[PDB]
Short mmCIF file of C-alpha atoms (C1' of nucleotides) and ligand atoms in Angstrom, two decimals:
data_model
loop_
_atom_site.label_atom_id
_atom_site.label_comp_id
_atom_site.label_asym_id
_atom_site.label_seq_id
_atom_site.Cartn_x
_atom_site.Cartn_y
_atom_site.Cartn_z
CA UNK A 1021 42.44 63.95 13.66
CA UNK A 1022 44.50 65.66 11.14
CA UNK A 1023 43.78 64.56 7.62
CA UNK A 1024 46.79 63.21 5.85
CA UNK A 1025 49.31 63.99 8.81
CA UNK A 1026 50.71 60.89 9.05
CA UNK A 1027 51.65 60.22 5.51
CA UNK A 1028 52.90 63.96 5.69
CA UNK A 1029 55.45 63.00 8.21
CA UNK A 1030 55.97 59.24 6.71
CA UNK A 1031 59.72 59.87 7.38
CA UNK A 1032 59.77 60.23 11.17
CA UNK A 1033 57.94 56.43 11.16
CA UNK A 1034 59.93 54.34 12.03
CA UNK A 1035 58.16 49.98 12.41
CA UNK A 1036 58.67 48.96 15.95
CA UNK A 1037 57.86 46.29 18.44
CA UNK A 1038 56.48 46.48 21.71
CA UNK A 1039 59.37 45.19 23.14
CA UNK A 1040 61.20 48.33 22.48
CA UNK A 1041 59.35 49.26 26.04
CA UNK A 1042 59.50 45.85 27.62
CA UNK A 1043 59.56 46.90 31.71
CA UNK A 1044 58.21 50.33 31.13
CA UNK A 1045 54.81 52.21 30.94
CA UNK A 1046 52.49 52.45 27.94
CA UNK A 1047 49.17 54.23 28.31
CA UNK A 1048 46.69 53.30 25.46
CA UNK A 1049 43.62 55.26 23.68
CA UNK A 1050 41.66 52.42 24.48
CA UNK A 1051 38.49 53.35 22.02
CA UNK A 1052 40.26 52.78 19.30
CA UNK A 1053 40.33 49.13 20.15
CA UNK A 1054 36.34 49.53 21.44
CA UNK A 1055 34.94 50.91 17.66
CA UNK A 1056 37.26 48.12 16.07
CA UNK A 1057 36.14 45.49 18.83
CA UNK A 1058 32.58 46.48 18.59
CA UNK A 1059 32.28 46.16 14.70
CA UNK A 1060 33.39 42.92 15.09
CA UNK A 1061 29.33 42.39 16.80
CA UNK A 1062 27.96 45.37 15.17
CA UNK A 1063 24.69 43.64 14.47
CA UNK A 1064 24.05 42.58 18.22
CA UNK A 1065 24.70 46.26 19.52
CA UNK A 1066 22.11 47.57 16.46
CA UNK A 1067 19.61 44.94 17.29
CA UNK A 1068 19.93 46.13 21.57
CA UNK A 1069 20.94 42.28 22.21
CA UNK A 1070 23.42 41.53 24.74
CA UNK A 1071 27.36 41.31 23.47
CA UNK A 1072 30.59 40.96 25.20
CA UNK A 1073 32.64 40.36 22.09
CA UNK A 1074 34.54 43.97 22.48
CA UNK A 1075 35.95 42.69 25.77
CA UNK A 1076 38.07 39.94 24.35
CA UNK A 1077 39.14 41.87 21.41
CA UNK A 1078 40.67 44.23 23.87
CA UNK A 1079 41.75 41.77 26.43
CA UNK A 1080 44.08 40.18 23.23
CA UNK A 1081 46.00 43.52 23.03
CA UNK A 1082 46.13 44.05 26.88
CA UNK A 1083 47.48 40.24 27.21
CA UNK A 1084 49.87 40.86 24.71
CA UNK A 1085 51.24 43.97 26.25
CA UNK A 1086 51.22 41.87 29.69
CA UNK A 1087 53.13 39.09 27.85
CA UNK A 1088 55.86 41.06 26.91
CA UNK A 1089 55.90 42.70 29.91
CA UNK A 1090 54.75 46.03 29.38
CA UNK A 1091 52.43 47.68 32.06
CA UNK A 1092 49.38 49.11 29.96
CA UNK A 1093 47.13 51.93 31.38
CA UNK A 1094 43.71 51.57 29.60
CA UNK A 1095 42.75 55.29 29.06
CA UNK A 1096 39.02 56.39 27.87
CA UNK A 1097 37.08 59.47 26.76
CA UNK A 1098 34.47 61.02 29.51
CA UNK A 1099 32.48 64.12 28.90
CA UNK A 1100 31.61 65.68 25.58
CA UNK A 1101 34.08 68.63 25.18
CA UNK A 1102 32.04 71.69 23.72
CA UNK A 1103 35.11 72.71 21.22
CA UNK A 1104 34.19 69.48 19.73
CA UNK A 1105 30.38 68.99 20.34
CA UNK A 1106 29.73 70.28 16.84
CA UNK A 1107 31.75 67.27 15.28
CA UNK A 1108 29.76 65.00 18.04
CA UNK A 1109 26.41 66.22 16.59
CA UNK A 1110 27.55 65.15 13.52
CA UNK A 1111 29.09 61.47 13.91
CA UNK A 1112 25.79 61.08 16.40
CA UNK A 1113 23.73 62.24 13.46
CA UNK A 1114 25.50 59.82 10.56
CA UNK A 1115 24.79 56.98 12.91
CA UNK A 1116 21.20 57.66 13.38
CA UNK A 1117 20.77 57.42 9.73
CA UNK A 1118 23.06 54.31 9.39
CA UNK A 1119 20.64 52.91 12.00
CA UNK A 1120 17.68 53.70 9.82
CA UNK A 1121 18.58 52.34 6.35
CA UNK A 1122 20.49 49.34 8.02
CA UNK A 1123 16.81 48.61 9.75
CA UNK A 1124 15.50 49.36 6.59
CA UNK A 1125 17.65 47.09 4.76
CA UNK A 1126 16.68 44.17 7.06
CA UNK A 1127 12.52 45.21 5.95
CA UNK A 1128 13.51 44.55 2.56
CA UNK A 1129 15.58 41.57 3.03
CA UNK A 1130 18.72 42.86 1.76
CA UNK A 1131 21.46 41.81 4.60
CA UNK A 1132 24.88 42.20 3.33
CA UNK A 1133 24.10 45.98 2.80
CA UNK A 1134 22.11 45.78 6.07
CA UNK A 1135 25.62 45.11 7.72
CA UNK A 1136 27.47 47.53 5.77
CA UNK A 1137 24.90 50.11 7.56
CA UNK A 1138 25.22 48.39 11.08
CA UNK A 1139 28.43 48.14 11.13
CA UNK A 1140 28.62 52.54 10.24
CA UNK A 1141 26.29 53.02 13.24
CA UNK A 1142 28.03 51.96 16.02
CA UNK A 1143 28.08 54.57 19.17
CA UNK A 1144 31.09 53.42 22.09
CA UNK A 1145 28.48 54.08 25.16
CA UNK A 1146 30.14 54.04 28.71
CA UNK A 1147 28.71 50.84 30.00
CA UNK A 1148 30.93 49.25 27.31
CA UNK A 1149 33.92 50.93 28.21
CA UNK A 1150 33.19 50.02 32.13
CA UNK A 1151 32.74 46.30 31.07
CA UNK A 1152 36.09 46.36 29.87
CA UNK A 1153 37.33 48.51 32.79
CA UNK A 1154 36.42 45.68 34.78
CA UNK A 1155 37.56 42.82 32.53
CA UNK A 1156 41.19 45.00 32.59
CA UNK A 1157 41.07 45.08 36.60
CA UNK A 1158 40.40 41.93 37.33
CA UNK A 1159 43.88 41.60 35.35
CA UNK A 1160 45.94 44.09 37.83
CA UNK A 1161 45.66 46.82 34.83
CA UNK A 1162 45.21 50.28 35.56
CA UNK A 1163 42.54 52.61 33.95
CA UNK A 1164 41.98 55.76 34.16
CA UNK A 1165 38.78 57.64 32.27
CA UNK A 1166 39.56 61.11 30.87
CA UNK A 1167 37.68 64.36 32.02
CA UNK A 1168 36.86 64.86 28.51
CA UNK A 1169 39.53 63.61 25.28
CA UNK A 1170 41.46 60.74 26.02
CA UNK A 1171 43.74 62.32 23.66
CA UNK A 1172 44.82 65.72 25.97
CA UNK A 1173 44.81 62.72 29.33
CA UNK A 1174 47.50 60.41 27.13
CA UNK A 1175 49.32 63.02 26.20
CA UNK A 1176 49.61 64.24 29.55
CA UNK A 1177 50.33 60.79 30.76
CA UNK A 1178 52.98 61.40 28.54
CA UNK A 1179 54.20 64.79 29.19
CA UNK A 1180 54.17 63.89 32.88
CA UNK A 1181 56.58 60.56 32.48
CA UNK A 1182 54.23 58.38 33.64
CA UNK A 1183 53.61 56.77 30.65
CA UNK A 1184 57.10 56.37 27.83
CA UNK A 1185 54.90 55.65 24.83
CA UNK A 1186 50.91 56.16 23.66
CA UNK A 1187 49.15 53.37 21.70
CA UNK A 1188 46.86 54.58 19.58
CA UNK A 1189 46.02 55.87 15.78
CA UNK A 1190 44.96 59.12 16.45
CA UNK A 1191 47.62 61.91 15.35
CA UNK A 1192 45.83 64.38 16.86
CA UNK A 1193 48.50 62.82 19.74
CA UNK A 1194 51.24 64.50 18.18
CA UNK A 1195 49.45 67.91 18.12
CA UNK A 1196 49.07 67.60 21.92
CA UNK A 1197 52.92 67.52 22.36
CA UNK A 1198 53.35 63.81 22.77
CA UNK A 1199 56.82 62.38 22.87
CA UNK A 1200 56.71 59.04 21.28
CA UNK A 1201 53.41 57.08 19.76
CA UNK A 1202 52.65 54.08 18.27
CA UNK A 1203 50.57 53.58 15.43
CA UNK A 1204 48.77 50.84 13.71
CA UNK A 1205 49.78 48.30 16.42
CA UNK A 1206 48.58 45.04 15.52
CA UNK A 1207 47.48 41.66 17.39
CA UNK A 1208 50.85 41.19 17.54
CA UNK A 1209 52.71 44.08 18.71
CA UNK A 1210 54.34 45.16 15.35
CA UNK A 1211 53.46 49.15 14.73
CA UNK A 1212 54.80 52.51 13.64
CA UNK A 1213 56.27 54.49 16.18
CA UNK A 1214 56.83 58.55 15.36
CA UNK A 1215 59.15 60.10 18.24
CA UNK A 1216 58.82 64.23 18.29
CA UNK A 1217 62.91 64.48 18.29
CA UNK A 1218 63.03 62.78 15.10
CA UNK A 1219 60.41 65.54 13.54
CA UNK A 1220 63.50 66.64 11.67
CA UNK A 1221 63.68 63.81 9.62
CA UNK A 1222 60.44 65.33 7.51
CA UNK A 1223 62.06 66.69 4.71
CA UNK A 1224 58.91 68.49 3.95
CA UNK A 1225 58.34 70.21 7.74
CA UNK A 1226 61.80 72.55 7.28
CA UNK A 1227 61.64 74.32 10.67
CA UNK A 1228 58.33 73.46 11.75
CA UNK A 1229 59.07 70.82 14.24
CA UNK A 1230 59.24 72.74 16.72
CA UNK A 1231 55.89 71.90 19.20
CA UNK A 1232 54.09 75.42 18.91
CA UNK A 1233 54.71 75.44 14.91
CA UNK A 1234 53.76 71.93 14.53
CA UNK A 1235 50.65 72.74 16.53
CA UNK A 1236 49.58 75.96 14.44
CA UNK A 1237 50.14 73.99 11.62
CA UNK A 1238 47.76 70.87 12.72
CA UNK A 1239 44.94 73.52 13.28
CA UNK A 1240 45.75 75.40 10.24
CA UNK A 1241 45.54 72.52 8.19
CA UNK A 1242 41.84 71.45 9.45
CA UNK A 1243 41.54 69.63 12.99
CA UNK A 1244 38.15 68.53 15.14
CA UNK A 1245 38.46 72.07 17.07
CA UNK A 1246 38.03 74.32 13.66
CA UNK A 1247 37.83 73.45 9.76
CA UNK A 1248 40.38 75.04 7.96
CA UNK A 1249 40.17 77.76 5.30
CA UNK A 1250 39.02 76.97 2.10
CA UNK A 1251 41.91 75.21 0.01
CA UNK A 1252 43.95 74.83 2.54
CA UNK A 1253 45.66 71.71 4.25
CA UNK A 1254 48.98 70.47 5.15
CA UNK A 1255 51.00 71.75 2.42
CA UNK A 1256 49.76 75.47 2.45
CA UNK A 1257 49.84 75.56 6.34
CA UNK A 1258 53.44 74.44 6.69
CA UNK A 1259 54.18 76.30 3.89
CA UNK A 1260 52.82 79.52 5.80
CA UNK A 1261 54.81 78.69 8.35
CA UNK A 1262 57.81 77.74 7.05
CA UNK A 1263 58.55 81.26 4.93
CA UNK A 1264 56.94 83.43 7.52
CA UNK A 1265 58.67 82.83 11.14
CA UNK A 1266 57.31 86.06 12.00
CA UNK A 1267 56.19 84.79 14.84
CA UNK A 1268 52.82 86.39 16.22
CA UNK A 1269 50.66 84.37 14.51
CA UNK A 1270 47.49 86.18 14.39
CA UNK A 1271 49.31 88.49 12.24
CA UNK A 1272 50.61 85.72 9.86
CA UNK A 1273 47.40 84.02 9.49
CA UNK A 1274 46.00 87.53 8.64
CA UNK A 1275 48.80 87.36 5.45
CA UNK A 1276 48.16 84.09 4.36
CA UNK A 1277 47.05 85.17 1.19
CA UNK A 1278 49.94 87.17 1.38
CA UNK A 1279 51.89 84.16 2.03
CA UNK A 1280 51.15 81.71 -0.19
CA UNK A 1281 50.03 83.90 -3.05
CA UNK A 1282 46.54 83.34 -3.61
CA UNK A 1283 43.26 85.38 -2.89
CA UNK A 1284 41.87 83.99 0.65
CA UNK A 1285 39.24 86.33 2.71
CA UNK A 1286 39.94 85.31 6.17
CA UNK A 1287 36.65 86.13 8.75
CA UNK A 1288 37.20 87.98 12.47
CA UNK A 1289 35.03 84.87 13.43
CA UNK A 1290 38.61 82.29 12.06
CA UNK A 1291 41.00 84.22 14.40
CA UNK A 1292 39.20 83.95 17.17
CA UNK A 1293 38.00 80.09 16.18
CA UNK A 1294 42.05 79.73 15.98
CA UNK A 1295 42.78 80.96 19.41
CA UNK A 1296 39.79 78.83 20.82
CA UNK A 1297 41.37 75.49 18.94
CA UNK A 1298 45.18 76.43 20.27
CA UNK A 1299 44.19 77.41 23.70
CA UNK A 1300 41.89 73.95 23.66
CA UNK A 1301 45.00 71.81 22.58
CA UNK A 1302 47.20 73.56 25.27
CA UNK A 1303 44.76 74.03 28.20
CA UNK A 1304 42.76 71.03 28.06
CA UNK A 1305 41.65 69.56 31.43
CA UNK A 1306 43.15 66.22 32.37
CA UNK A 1307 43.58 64.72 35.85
CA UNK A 1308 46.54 63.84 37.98
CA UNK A 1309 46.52 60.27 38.63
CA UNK A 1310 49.00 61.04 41.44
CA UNK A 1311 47.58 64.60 43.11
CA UNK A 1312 44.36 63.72 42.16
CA UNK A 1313 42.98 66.31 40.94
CA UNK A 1314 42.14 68.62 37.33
CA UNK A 1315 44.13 70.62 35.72
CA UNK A 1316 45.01 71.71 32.06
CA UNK A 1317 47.13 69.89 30.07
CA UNK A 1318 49.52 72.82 30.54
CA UNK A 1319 50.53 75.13 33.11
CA UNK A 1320 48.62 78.32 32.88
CA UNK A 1321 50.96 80.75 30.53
CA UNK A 1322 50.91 84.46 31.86
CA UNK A 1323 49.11 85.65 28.12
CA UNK A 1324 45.60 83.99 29.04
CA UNK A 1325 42.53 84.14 31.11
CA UNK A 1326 41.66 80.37 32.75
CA UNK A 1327 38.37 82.30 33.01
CA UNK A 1328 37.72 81.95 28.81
CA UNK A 1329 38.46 78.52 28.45
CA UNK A 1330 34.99 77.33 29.24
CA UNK A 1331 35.33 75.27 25.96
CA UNK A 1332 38.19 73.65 26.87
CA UNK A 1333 36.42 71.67 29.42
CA UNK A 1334 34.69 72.51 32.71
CA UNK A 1335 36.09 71.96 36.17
CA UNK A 1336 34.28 69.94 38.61
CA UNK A 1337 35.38 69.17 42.23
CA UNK A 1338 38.29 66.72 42.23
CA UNK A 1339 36.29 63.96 44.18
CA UNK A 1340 33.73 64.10 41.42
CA UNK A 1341 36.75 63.98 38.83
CA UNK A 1342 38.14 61.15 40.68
CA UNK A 1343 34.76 59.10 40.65
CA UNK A 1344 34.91 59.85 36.77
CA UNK A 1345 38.67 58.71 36.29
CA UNK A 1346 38.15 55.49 37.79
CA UNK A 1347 34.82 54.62 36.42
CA UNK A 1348 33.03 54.83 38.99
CA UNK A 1349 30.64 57.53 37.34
CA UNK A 1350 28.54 57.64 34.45
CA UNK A 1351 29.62 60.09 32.13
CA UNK A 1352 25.90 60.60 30.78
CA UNK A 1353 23.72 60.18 33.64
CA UNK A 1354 26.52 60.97 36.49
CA UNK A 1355 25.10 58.24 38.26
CA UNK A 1356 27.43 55.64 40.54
CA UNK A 1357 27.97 52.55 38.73
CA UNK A 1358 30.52 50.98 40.55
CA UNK A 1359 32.12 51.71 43.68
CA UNK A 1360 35.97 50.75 43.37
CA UNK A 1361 38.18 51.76 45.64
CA UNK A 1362 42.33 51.33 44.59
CA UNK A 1363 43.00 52.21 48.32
CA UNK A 1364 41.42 49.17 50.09
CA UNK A 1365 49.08 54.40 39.06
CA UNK A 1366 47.62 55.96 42.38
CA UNK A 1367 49.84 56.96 44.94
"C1'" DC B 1004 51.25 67.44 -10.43
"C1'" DG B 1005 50.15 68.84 -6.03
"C1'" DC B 1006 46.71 69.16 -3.17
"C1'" DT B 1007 42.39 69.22 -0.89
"C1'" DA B 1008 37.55 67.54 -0.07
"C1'" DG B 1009 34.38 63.53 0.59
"C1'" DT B 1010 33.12 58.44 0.49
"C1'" DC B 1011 34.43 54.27 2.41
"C1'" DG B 1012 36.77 50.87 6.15
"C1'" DT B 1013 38.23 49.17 10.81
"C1'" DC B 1014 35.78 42.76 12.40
"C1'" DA B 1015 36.67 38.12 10.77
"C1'" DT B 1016 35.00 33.03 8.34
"C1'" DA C 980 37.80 56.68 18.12
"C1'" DC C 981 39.67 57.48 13.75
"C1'" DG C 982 42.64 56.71 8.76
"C1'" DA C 983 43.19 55.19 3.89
"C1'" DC C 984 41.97 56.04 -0.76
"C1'" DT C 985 40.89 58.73 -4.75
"C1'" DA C 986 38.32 61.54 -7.93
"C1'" DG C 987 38.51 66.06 -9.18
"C1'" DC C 988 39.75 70.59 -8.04
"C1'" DG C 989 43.09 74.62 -9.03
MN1 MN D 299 31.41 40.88 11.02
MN1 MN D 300 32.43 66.19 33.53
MN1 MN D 301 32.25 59.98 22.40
MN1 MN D 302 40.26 60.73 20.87
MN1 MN D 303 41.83 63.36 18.35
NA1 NA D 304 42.00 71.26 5.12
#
DNA sequence: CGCTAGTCGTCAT
DNA sequence: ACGACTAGCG
């Protein structure tokens, strides 16, 4: 996520209905509506006893979009992506404690404090995520599990015209090169929609709405892939960007000080962190529903080496991928959990 | 003031 | 999976 983005770009929200798609395709960052769903029984999933609450909270949102006839594609996140491991060790390791003092609350009687840790501990595992892969197929609604990010398989969804809109309230979407999302949908369809033409309503972008700016900006500023520089944030990136259209960008991020007049040391080690985050929010891998197969989120440019982009996910054989996509396989354990087949979205 | 860096909140009775 | 809010920084 980048901090602060959307009230950056207030001025390109514009409050919507779902109905503004009614007949088309809407493909949704469904774990957004699994940590909110799954708060809701926070206590059940900390004590290890059995819950199904998270289903219904989702199947609300999917009826809804079914109501008003939208066709919702249920999108979740698969493997651990290494670019972002470090921020996975971290969330994993907050929980943990969460899980301690909440437990330790409950030794001491204290409960109200005891929920206010349980409900700060809560880990999306993907036997959750299949329940309500199964709850949304036994309503004719597709899924589809991401190789790794949900956020690089929406936006390729997207990017693809498969999907006209993404439901979620990550704006890490918009980094990705996402055409139109909607944010802060509620149990009744009313969000915020930002569409990527209307970037130039921002007063405060200038010329940065253009997809590769906007991008170096989101990473300059501080995203999941690489914390930013010390001081710096939204302002000071698009600021950097805005007087300096120069436009190789290692070169510009080595003047930033220059730029924006203020003493900043900038490591070797934050150029090459840079290229890593940019090459991870243009390359990511994301499966074809259709070919059925991987592939990065963009085409190969000629300026870069598939070969280095280990950290932008791994390729596996597309059968395996496949399995994973329609959650068939474990992400953890890789093991067969179910054994759906659509043949007996695809096609 | 503008801005960035951390601590809290998402559910729902 | 994330964002909102704000105290305190320059
Ligand atoms: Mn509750
Ligand atoms: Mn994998
Ligand atoms: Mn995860
Ligand atoms: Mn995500
Ligand atoms: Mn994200
Ligand atoms: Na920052």
């Amino acid at each position: 996520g980048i901090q602060g983005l959307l009230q950056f770009i207030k001025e390109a929200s514009e409050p919507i209905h779902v109905r503004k798609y009614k007949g088309q395709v809407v493909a949704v960052d469904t774990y957004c509506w699994l940590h909110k769903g799954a708060i809701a029984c926070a206590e059940k999933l900390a004590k290890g006893e059995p819950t199904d609450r998270y289903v219904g909270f989702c199947m609300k949102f999917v009826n809804m979009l079914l109501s008003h006839g939208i066709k919702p594609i249920l999108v979740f996140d698969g493997c651990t992506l290494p670019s972002k491991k470090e921020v996975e060790r971290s969330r994993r390791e907050r929980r943990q404690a969460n899980l301690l003092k909440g437990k330790q609350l409950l030794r001491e009687g204290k409960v109200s404090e005891a929920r206010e840790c349980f409900t700060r501990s809560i880990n999306i595992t993907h036997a959750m995520a299949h329940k309500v892969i199964k709850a949304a197929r036994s309503q004719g609604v597709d899924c589809l599990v991401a190789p790794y990010e949900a956020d690089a398989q929406l936006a390729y969804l997207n990017k693809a015209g498969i999907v006209q809109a993404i439901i979620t309230e990550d704006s890490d979407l918009l980094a990705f090169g996402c055409k139109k999302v909607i944010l802060k949908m509620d149990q009744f369809g009313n969000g915020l929609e930002i569409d990527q033409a209307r970037l130039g309503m921002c007063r405060q972008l200038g010329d940065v709405f253009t997809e590769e700016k906007f991008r170096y900006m989101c990473i300059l500023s501080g995203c999941a892939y690489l914390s930013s520089l010390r001081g710096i944030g939204l302002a000071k990136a698009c600021k950097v960007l805005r007087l300096a259209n120069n436009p190789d960008i290692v070169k510009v991020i080595k003047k930033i000080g220059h730029y924006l007049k203020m003493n900043i040391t900038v490591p070797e080690d934050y150029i090459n962190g840079f290229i890593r985050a940019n090459n991870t929010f243009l390359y990511q891998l994301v499966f074809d529903p259709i070919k059925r197969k991987l592939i990065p989120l963009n085409a190969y440019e000629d300026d870069v080496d598939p070969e280095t982009l280990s950290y932008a996910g791994q390729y596996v054989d597309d059968s395996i991928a496949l399995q994973i996509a329609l959650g068939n396989k474990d992400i953890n354990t890789f093991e067969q959990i179910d054994d759906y087949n659509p043949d007996t979205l695809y096609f």
